């Protein structure tokens, strides 16, 4: 029958037995993400274009307060935020939240899909409050997921137990459950990268896309994707199968992407899901941060894909 | 001070002296678009599971129907009919319309944006109307434009005078202007293609991407994107510049677009926006069309970097 | 088929053959209202509350703005406005229009229905603009018309061949005829009259009332309901039958509801619906205003119990 | 700061200590009246007048289905169910709900206000779950409130601690508490009856009302109001000050309201706001009900507006 984000979050916390701290964590979230995809959705432009009487600064201000009145948080990470903000002793909570308010920000001029993407840890180190904190492997994380702002709202997140996906109907405010334990095809038929890169790419990279045109065994080629929004990219990965990747090149010697809030949410929600998050090297979430703002290389997808991958990584070395 | 597409479009009928029957079929594209982008965004979606006890199709229905009702229309070419729709003679008016309602609907699942495509014809002949009205070239389009259903909804109209861009205030439910008389950038810094088909692109496609990757001249190599929805690429490479490519391969000799409603009002947006449209071989606008679904090679974009394409198609002439 | 507000005024401006300048200024009121509406509903009150970190004034504006860019009026007479707003002479136009933005301000706190109320003159005569050009009876309205914000938002426009009803379908924004060439019935059930000014009532008025709380004839007596806005129980008149009363008094001998754009504008849609509306000692639509801000005591609805009170009246000369 | 009905509901669970079952209940009961806003403001209507592709009944089901669901409730009334409706042992719970899904539907037509009531016992004589569990007089309620849909959408909440108000931003859907502890005035100034009914009104009613309209030390006399919804004229009582009659007379010799689902919330609600609720003779929460589609009379109001009818009753007795 019907599964409103608020129900199944309450559910999960009885069965947890928790204390209703990461419940109300995760009902100020979601408030969130309804206020972004709003303004996203550009409703009251008319009073901008004078009926009469920023979209990233304006999402970093949104998830920071609502965050706080929750009264479950203790440090905060932003992409927008040079140092990692300590919340006052009064609002105080054991959670410790690492995010990107608006991720693919240089889109939005565009009007490509965008999103926010979270990740929640548990302070276990009872010292005071600080960035220290929030320098935990992703392996630690106690649940981490995204919004993506495409056609329509989707908020996918992940736990424990499971990811699930569920549908903002606009209508009455309300996410929906559309979706239950979802995984990932083993083998998908699209790959995603920017190869604009190539000239940077590095052996095994440029191996593996090259197999993904011309295939040894003649089967069907690889189709290509590349919406230049990681939120977007991954979600079409999860759904549709297949491997993103945003490998270290020339500009980028350690990739692009941020540890705390893009490459372990979207790498825990991955292997949630049965697939596989790696840096080429090792698994995203065993990496233990030392900045907040750290970068990292990642490539991730279904487990056939990405093992492939792994396998040329090997041979090169 | 504020345009909204109702005053727009009323303006610009009344300085061409029209009868107001164009008036109307504006005014009917527009309620199409709102009606479409709405349930697009998922509006609703609680009572599809159970609250109280085909997206394509939908699409269809809202501009076949809200069209007829405009009494400005005598022939309908759909995406989806396999046969033209002829007006009954009661609603019959001047107008041929060709539309793709929702381009992209293979995305539709995994949440990539969509978009709405259409091109208006005048009726040439004074004789029963039939398919034969609606083959006329690019070139003799009254009106065309596209609806993107994004991050936001935005509408995009050209008419002989320019293109103008009115986003969507679903608050209201009116289209505000927000760009007037757009014009491309004279050279981009993307190119945008489906590069899973290499092992089919003619010689021409595969020397220029490979130009764009490692520049003979030692410049920047350009960035790489590419949607999956053209409504999406193709209004990323209007407002950022660049080249959007479907060129053929064995994926039909002739290529995948559709030239009436797909080719056609893009080419007719770009042209009018300063950029260039071409098969390699031809203008699009210039082609004769022989049947309502008549695909056809498309190259669209920036005019510096679509004509250096056509000067590596000379080449291999 | 289903039609619109905006392919009504447009098929009415058609046959009517107008230059489209009053097209204009029926879709700049469509707008307006629907904007109005947005705020009533309370939509980005959460803004206000600090989630990120004057309803009558908002009203106000909107109109004033929205009616100037409309390059359709010459004079604005505002209920919140000590002069009539004379027009740039760039945007000015020959239509004339008085209104009240939010009609039952005073209800706002309580959340009772509230509305906006229009009447549209021609300016007659030939010379600079001036509140003079309002001073016109209402005989001489070439539109009339109310927007109720109630359980659902309704737009009731009324014009020399009839009155029509609109529902504004807030998921597209857009009004649709529910309702055409409404008459009223030709005798109710409902009185509906402020009893609390009792003490002060004219002895017509007073025995009027009480011949529906005791009929004479032993018949049912009639239901009381009084909203207190004048948009709610004027539009449950229209709808249900019955009749509305605001005599003179204590407050005020001339009444509290102004002629110009509160009585006229609903003197004309109860007319144009088949029913009466009179001051008791003679029509309202045919009184020749002195000032702008006016007053003027109205009764009216359902001609048999108009003509019922007006006997009453006769009856005490 | 920012308080949600989300985030206020589950604090009060947390002090309360509560097994978070009530919680549930009482965000199953928000997100049934977001759902039936959404219906009544008419959301989607362009559907219905064939844009192409039962307001109290689909409340019904939706409040029913949306309860049910929450695995809290074991016994459920209906203004519209003749008969209890026991939940199945499969998704009982320990509460019954007494409510009026869509009150004032006799006014849908005209756009009048309209409301949901609600009121919410515990279960506490442990046997098999039937009828007689919702047999408790209202003093024994656990939580009541209302959900008015005016000019705005606000919900009113009652429990042991106080009253407050939550107003709906539809743009987000979500509840904000706009005020807290909520108390009514000691004295009105407004008395709200159907005069209509006056011939059957008994002496005690007469009198006071011609207090009101005459008073005997000649002071301002009373304005008078009657929406015909309860919700809306309880709501404006609540709010303004006042008092609140529908005493019983001749067609209603018990009085028409019924005591379960209209009368006991609206007077728990009055109660906790610091005014009184009688029926002329006894306080309404007090009387032990025997049919659950139980009648009976109500004055409920300021204090010392309805003491002074009190001290009337007791004069005629
Ligand atoms: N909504 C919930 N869903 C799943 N697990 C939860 C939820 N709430 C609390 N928990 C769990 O119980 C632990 C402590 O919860 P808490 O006492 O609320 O801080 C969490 O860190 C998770 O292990
Ligand atoms: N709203 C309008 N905007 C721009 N051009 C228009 C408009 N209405 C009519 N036209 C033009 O005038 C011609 C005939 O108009 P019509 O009588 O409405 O069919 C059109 O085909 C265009 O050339
Ligand atoms: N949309 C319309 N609907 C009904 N009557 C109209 C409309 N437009 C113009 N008229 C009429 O024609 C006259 C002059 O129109 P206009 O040139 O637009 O000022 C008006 O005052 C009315 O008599
Ligand atoms: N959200 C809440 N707010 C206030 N009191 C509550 C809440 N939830 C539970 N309670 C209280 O605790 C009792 C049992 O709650 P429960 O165990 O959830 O059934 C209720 O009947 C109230 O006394
Ligand atoms: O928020 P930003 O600054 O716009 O960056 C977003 C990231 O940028 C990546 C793409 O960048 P490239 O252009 O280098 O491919 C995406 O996969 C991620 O969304
Ligand atoms: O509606 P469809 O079937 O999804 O077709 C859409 C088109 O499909 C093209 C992409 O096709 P490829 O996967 O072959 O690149 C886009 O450029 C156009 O939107
Ligand atoms: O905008 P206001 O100041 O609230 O005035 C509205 C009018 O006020 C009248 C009621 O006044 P009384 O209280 O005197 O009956 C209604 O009929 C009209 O809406
Ligand atoms: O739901 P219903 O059948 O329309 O009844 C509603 C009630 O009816 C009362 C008024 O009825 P009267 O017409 O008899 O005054 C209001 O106070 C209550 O909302
Ligand atoms: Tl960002
Ligand atoms: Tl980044
Ligand atoms: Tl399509
Ligand atoms: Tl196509
Ligand atoms: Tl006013
Ligand atoms: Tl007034
Ligand atoms: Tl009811
Ligand atoms: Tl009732």
Redesign the pocket.
């Known amino acids: 029958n019907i599964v409103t984000l608020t129900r199944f979050?309450?559910?999960?916390?009885?069965?947890?037995?928790?204390?209703?701290?990461?419940?109300?964590?995760?009902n100020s979230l979601c408030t969130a993400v309804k206020a972004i995809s709003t303004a996203v959705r550009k409703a009251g432009i008319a009073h901008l274009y004078g009926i009469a009487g920023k979209l990233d600064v304006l999402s970093n201000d949104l998830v920071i307060n609502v965050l706080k009145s929750s009264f479950?948080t203790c440090v905060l990470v932003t992409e927008e935020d040079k140092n990692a903000i300590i919340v006052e002793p009064e609002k105080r909570?054991?959670?410790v939240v690492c995010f990107d308010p608006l991720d693919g920000s240089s889109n939005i001029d565009c009007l490509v899909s965008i999103g926010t993407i979270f990740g929640i840890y548990?302070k276990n180190s009872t010292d005071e409050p600080s960035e220290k904190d929030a320098l935990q492997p992703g392996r630690n994380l106690?649940?981490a997921g995204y919004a993506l702002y495409g056609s329509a709202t989707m908020l996918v997140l992940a736990?424990?137990?499971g990811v699930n996906c569920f549908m903002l109907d606009p209508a009455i405010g309300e996410f929906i459950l559309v979706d239950r334990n979802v995984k990932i095809k083993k083998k998908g038929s699209i790959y995603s990268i920017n190869e604009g890169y190539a000239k940077e790419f590095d052996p095994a990279i440029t191996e593996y896309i090259q197999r993904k045109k011309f295939p040894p065994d003649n089967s069907a080629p690889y189709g290509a994707r590349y919406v230049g929004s990681m939120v977007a990219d991954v979600h079409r990965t999860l759904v549709y199968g297949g491997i993103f990747m945003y490998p270290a090149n020339k500009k980028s010697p350690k990739g692009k992407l941020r540890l705390l809030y893009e490459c372990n949410p979207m790498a825990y929600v991955m292997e949630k899901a049965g697939g596989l998050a790696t840096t080429g090297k090792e698994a995203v979430l065993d990496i233990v941060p030392t900045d907040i703002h750290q970068r990292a290389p990642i490539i991730l997808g279904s487990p056939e894909d990405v093992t492939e991958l792994l396998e040329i990584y090997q041979k090169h070395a």
Chains 1, 2, 3, 4 share one sequence.
């Open positions: 979050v309450m559910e999960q916390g009885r069965k947890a037995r928790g204390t209703g701290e990461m419940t109300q964590l995760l479950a909570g054991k959670y548990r106690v649940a736990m424990v137990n």
